[PDB]
Design an enzyme around this catalytic site. Structure first.
Site, PDB file in Angstrom:
ATOM      1  N   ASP A 187      -5.099  -2.903  -3.571  1.00  0.00           N
ATOM      2  CA  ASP A 187      -4.791  -1.483  -3.701  1.00  0.00           C
ATOM      3  C   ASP A 187      -3.319  -1.169  -3.931  1.00  0.00           C
ATOM      4  O   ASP A 187      -2.993  -0.284  -4.722  1.00  0.00           O
ATOM      5  CB  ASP A 187      -5.344  -0.666  -2.517  1.00  0.00           C
ATOM      6  CG  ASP A 187      -4.897  -1.172  -1.156  1.00  0.00           C
ATOM      7  OD1 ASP A 187      -5.124  -0.427  -0.176  1.00  0.00           O
ATOM      8  OD2 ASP A 187      -4.348  -2.288  -1.043  1.00  0.00           O
ATOM      9  N   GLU A 241       0.858  -1.183   0.000  1.00  0.00           N
ATOM     10  CA  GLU A 241       0.000   0.000   0.000  1.00  0.00           C
ATOM     11  C   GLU A 241       0.898   1.238   0.000  1.00  0.00           C
ATOM     12  O   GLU A 241       0.742   2.141  -0.827  1.00  0.00           O
ATOM     13  CB  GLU A 241      -0.883   0.001   1.252  1.00  0.00           C
ATOM     14  CG  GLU A 241      -1.543   1.330   1.580  1.00  0.00           C
ATOM     15  CD  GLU A 241      -2.104   1.361   2.992  1.00  0.00           C
ATOM     16  OE1 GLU A 241      -3.219   0.848   3.216  1.00  0.00           O
ATOM     17  OE2 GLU A 241      -1.416   1.891   3.888  1.00  0.00           O
TER      18      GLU A 241
END
Length: 386
Positions: A135, A74
């Protein structure tokens, strides 16, 4: 060197406003200063197991499979986007970027090797040990498209090729579900109905389409908008918010303690706090009307909720608008400000929001997302096109 999109690009997207009580030079200066502080505190390159590799220092956390997590995919994604955008200002941008990419590929996923394992730990044994998180890979893959348009792909690293491989062989293969949604990682099912709205990076997917020609990305975008609306009309008719995690079809808020991530997985918490920025960027960069509708609803709600005072925003809300949090942190505040840029009648609120976030320093999570938000609302996050 040889940047084709050197900072500051300070672009003016159609239908969007920027803070207008200060000059663009002031906006750019605030971003430069914030970046220097962010880099000084979070950009790392001290992996004994990978000399020359870079990563982003995350919060102190518990061990993972016997390893001590220093950063995550991330953070790697946030750092890679930030680095390419600051090229032109930071003379070592490309070196840092290639170093971040080195880490991303060395710490490849134990599942789909075209993706990055979610944990960066200083051990050879950790390299290729962990599975992925959607993500992180989305931001990393997108950063490669930015790198391609920034420096070209004729050098040491073929950015475009790396991007296409990661997008198609990695994200599409492992994270795009049969129902045209995005699952949680390459460890999740191809038919999974579990999804994290903050992964719905609409503007990233637009670029994926343009640089691959794969209509799959447009199908996903359109479906995710349908899911957002179906979810909100039923569970957040007054706020327009969405929960940290969403499950089933039709979509419903995830239960509390989902995957034991937190007790607020059913509400607008730390994961979902990022959604407003991810959504609004689609209207600004691609003119998607559905993005403006979703953005204006959330913007109007938070403005009334706080009576126009950004400092009154708290860290977490139930879908009906009641409070979960108690204080203002940038990962929540800044995206709310970004979501407000599609209506000129929000100028005062946007200016106040800018004043609040411009020098707000706290920790890895809020600082990193704050810098990304600042880059976008100042027009310095330009659009990568073929």
């Amino acid at each position: 060197a040889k940047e084709m999109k050197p900072f500051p690009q300070q672009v003016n997207y159609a239908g969007v406003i920027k803070p207008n009580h200060v000059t663009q030079e002031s906006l750019n200066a605030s971003v430069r200063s914030y970046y220097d502080n962010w880099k000084k505190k979070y950009l790392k390159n001290d992996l004994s197991s990978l000399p020359g590799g870079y990563y982003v220092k995350g919060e102190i956390t518990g061990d993972a499979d016997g390893f001590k997590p220093l950063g995550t995919s991330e953070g790697q994604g946030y750092g890679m986007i930030i680095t390419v955008l600051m090229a032109g200002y930071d003379s070592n941008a490309q070196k840092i970027y290639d170093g971040l990419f080195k880490t991303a590929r060395t710490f490849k996923s134990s599942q789909n090797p075209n993706l990055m394992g979610w944990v960066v730990a200083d051990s050879k044994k950790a390299q290729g040990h962990f599975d992925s998180a959607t993500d992180g890979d989305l931001d990393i893959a997108y950063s490669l498209l930015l790198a391609h348009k920034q420096w070209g792909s004729n050098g040491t690293v073929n950015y475009l090729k790396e991007a296409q491989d990661m997008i198609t062989k990695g994200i599409k293969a492992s994270n795009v579900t049969n129902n045209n949604q995005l699952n949680l990682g390459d460890w999740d099912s191809k038919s999974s109905l579990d999804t994290r709205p903050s992964d719905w990076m609409m503007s990233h997917l637009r670029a994926f389409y343009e640089f691959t020609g794969d209509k799959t990305w447009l199908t996903v975008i359109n479906n995710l908008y349908d899911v957002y609306t179906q979810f909100s009309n039923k569970y957040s008719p007054n706020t327009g918010l969405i929960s940290d995690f969403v499950v089933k079809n039709p979509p419903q808020p995830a239960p509390k303690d989902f995957l034991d991530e937190s007790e607020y997985t059913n509400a607008y918490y730390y994961n979902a706090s990022r959604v407003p920025l991810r959504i609004v960027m689609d209207y600004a960069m691609y003119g998607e009307k559905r993005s403006k509708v979703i953005s204006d609803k959330v913007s109007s709600w938070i403005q009334n909720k706080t009576n126009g005072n950004p400092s009154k925003i708290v860290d977490g809300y139930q879908l009906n608008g009641s409070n979960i949090g108690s204080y203002p942190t940038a990962v929540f505040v800044s995206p709310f400000i970004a979501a407000s840029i599609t209506s000129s009648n929000n100028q005062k609120w946007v200016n106040s929001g800018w004043d609040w976030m411009k020098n707000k320093r706290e920790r890895y999570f809020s600082d990193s997302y704050n810098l990304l938000t600042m880059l976008f609302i100042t027009g310095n996050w330009w659009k990568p096109v073929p």
